[model samples]
Target chain A: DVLLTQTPLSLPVSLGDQASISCRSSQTIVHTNGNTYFEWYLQKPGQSPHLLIYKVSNRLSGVPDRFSGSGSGTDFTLKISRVEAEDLGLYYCFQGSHSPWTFGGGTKLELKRADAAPTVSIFPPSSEQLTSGGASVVCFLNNFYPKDINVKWKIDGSERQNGVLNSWTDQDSKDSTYSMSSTLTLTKDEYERHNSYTCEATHKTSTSPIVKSFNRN
Target chain B: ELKLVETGGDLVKPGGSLTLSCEASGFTLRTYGMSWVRQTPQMRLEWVASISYGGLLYFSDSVKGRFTISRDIVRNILTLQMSRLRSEDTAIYYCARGTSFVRYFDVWGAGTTVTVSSAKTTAPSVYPLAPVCGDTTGSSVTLGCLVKGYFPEPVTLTWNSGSLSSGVHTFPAVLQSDLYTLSSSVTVTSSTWPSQSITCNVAHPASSTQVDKKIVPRAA
Candidate 1:
């Protein structure tokens, strides 16, 4: 199993300044197919991690040239020529060339501060996911600054660990704040037991879990 | 023999409401009144609403128009309704047999865990209402799932298909000074079964979502 180690975990930079993060692998990430299977991701606060650098050096389509990736063997770098206010959050690296693909510990981009808390909303499973076979229930957090928020779900009183899929936090562009959705699926058996379902969003600017609960009504 | 059975606790959203039922047995509603009392983290006891055995009512400034206490003589149940919630309204709500006129919570039901979960504001607030801490630095810590999250704290861990076996580590509270942050794992013994017999389940605190698994024995 290969491991990816990222450095300068807490990056402190000013707006419009250059920033760089290093991701090194314990072993060569060169696959037998003659392609390096390493990629870089930027998890903007509250937003889902998006692809930036792939195959070690090539930037993904539409990514700003201000961001570049370069290096071979086991050492790689993700360099941001000019960081913007929206570029803040966490950065990470992934390696898939080896047997068990691995991800780096992650690096946080900081020293920057327009921050807003998310607007939290949750909906009951449609088609009576409650009354029917218990289907997908969605919790949408909208219009938040910084793309680094977390979501949690509780059914009845127990917390849900499985059958939960959260989409990446996306930017509004118009507002520059972030938004995301999380879907919690319940099977036929599990749906019948739903007396209550709670969706909580935690944001940096706020305290407590911003919560919304649901019943059949 | 007299007894009271209330419904399970629930999480209320900002601007949301809930109704908690107190089912009474072996007693006549016409003879004994039921008062709804509550306690907060602020260490104060509040009895802002009450219902009489004769079906009379009482309401105070603390609850006033937003709360309704009613009696169902046919079903022998006392119900409390709460509306237009705020974060400061979070607390343990209880139902007591009498105290409206007697001035004491004579008979009390187990407090329902009422939490005004998060925000109701379209814009962010200036202050917080709760955090995760003092959980680290333990000796011989076994695998568990109680970690910090987003801007707040407190995470619960459950196993496949959801948990028949669930475990929690951190105290349920808001966190301080953390953007995101776990060791949560579950296992079975060799005596329990062979290595592949009963599948163990776990999760990562940082993973956006997790997989669904069945915790039962393998189908032959």
Candidate 2:
């Protein structure tokens, strides 16, 4: 299983502007399974987290059908048709399909931007397979002395990249854990790729940020 | 981050109108919509309306023509108004934030006390009405009670037959802000209505005493 990451400058996107984020996987999240088990979450500012989409593409019970998710094995996407003024807060993805369950660094949907890197890139790691919704996926940022960071999903070959980010800093052991996940929906049609996906986690603590890729297949 | 402070009171004398207000002070008022919720002393929640930050306007679907929700955007306050009050209108009022689905009463105000009395008021007088029962079958009947004059507040309705075999009833007073009194109607459909004496009771946050009445079916 792989972990996805993102770091958007803004928490809630300003009314008219576009909101974007990225997701990467450790391996190609493809397999010969029935359905993938990847899911995404959204937590409005001050509110507890809620399921936004599950099994990648299928929206949760009460979520408006307007919310559409799309992406492939190592890369995924979450699109809110129109960002109503009320649509504000954070977003995340989890890989319940696999053990060592993990959550992507949440993307805080704030009103302004305050992060680094305006680009989102998704590249398939050397060895991995892709699968469909509810299928297994990996997520975790290994051995970071202090883990206070935001992970986001990057659009493939996109000029300007933007996405959601979840941030956390562990206090005890004086250590920290930071990672994020992204979700995209695939239909029986998109299942041509076995409807699988991956989550990629990146850590920027080192002079050269350590990049890790995990997949769910 | 928001906190609503309740300053109004309940207990309106018959014929006197009662009003209550919820105040907030931490976050900018315009960022979120404020709503009035009612819970009688028995604890049943009712949704009143969502107050727009810009116009002090309230939009509610459950209100009859009795109550009104108006906001003082300039003062960061929301108030409930009622007309033609009475003794039966007593309940606890609360102010909340966000929409219904995401409704998190993050900022709750301390309840105001309003008692509907017959002493004085700007509106006309209202008389005390008894509990109404219907939907009866064979020997079973469902009882309902009404208490007016409370808005953005809550009240409890209880049906008693000598013993408290059934639990307390609850109703919210969000829409009936002042003029028209509203009470939760508790229906106790007993196996045999002729054998049971059904009573409807109303209670509020401030009073230890509950106002109630009973009815017994006459042999046809």
Candidate 3:
């Protein structure tokens, strides 16, 4: 049995820009006859996937000149000369050199956009009464650009690492921007103290760090 | 029907790699084709790559070079490995089963979420490639507009041809590596061809931008 692996899972390319996705195979894809039967396909959104490259590096008939394939044995590469807007979709690498033919876990070609500053808000517990039990504080950042942002927690200006941080892009939005939320749990005793909890958001598009502070005072 | 289960880590750094395992049951591993497929956050499904029952492996043109798909007979496991993690690689991945030559996925596993970070940003560029002509039968003419090189969702191409809109067809977007290319065709009769000028407008919602291309038909 043979296995093929693809990494990165996605490629973000600017329009008219170049990009490459890789596929690696376990066991020499080279058959006993010295021929490798690796192939590539492109799946556009809402459309059936079609062959783009075959027999290692040959471009399929009617394919544009911009798409090319290369590599040997265990490593293979698909390179796009200049990414077009319609190229934003999924790409797959398949190995036909050996049985139970297998395919890589698809690498998506995503469209990239400029960075946008994120808006942040903090949601603290509404109750003024404090107890020994733990409580959770949530900080949400919305409409962030570039899909990458960092969130950190601070108690009374001191960094807190014990709190759990969860973040994800808002997949439902049609806009290219993203949103994320981080939740931190604190002991009731710690929550009643004079300590101030701050959720700080750092992004490339923002000149000044965005900070949202919550306190039980 | 076969049952497929996919297992993998949730996070990987940029330039790093990870392996995902697919376990199968309810069917013999050697009898059917095993493949990996993925869907974007937008719910667009992509057939990544596949292994035929006869031991022949095939890859999607988009990922042909860098990704590998293999299987282990002893463990009843099919493995997928992908490298060079980037922010956009984040998506839900699934393991599927179908026929070898006929690519139809009948069974699929619950998807696993993957997140890649350290992202850089750039907007899409929209431009019109040269148009292709097909089947000019003296009285009727066919013209196609090929739009190439755009990025990041929501490109709408509209054709305007003097209100005589009847024979019009637009093909789905075609994947060209990491970018996209699409085309649309309009057919007109000879009586309307000489006086008609066709306009193609490509719009990208991300940047709120639009580009236009025009074609004037004449006796050839």
DockQ of every candidate:
0.01, 0.01, 0.01
Q: What is the lDDT of candidate 1?
A: 0.58
Instruction: Report RMSD for candidate 2.
Output: 28.4
Q: What is the two-chain DockQ of model 2?
A: 0.01
lDDT of 3 by residue, A1-217 (tens): 5677776686776667898999888788765566677778777644445668877788866789999999996899999998776676678887655654566778878767677776555545323212326455655566567777888888899888785546454221244455665656667777767458788878998677778775555
State candidate 1's DockQ: 0.01
Compute fnat per model: 0.00, 0.00, 0.00
> Estimated TM-score per prediction?
0.34, 0.28, 0.44
Q: How would you encode candidate 2's per-residue C-alpha lDDT over B1-220 as one tens digit per residue?
A: 4467767675565666767787878865666767665543433233455565454454433444567777776797877776665443455566755422222233445555555554322221111222122234434333334343433233455556335544222332323223333322233445645465556555654434356565444221
| Candidate with better lDDT, 1 vs 2 | 1
lDDT of 1 by residue, A118-207 (tens): 655454443322344545555556657677888889888688888775554334333556566565766867666667878887888787
- Give the poorly placed runs of model 1, Cα more than 4 Å off: A1-217, B1-3, B8-13, B99-103, B117-141, B147-170, B175-220
Worst 10 residues of 2 chain B by lDDT: B122-131
What does the lDDT read for residue A126 in candidate 1? Answer: 36
What TM-score does prediction 3 earn?
A: 0.44
Answer with 1 or 3, whichever has the higher lDDT. 3
Once superposed on the true structure, which residue ranges of model 2 sit more than 4 Å away at CA? A1-217, B54-62, B86-88, B99-104, B117-220
Q: What tens digits encode model 1's per-residue C-alpha lDDT throughout B1-220?
A: 5566667456567788988888877676666777666656543444457666567777756577787988888888888888897777787776767422322233456556576766221211111101011111222111222222342221334543354343212122332233222222332333432224222233332223332233332112
Which runs in model 3 stand beyond 4 Å of their true positions?
A1-12, A24-75, A80-92, A99-111, A126-132, A170-173, B1-95, B101-220
Q: In terms of docking quality, how is candidate 2 classified?
A: incorrect
Of 1 and 2, which scores higher on TM-score? Answer: 1
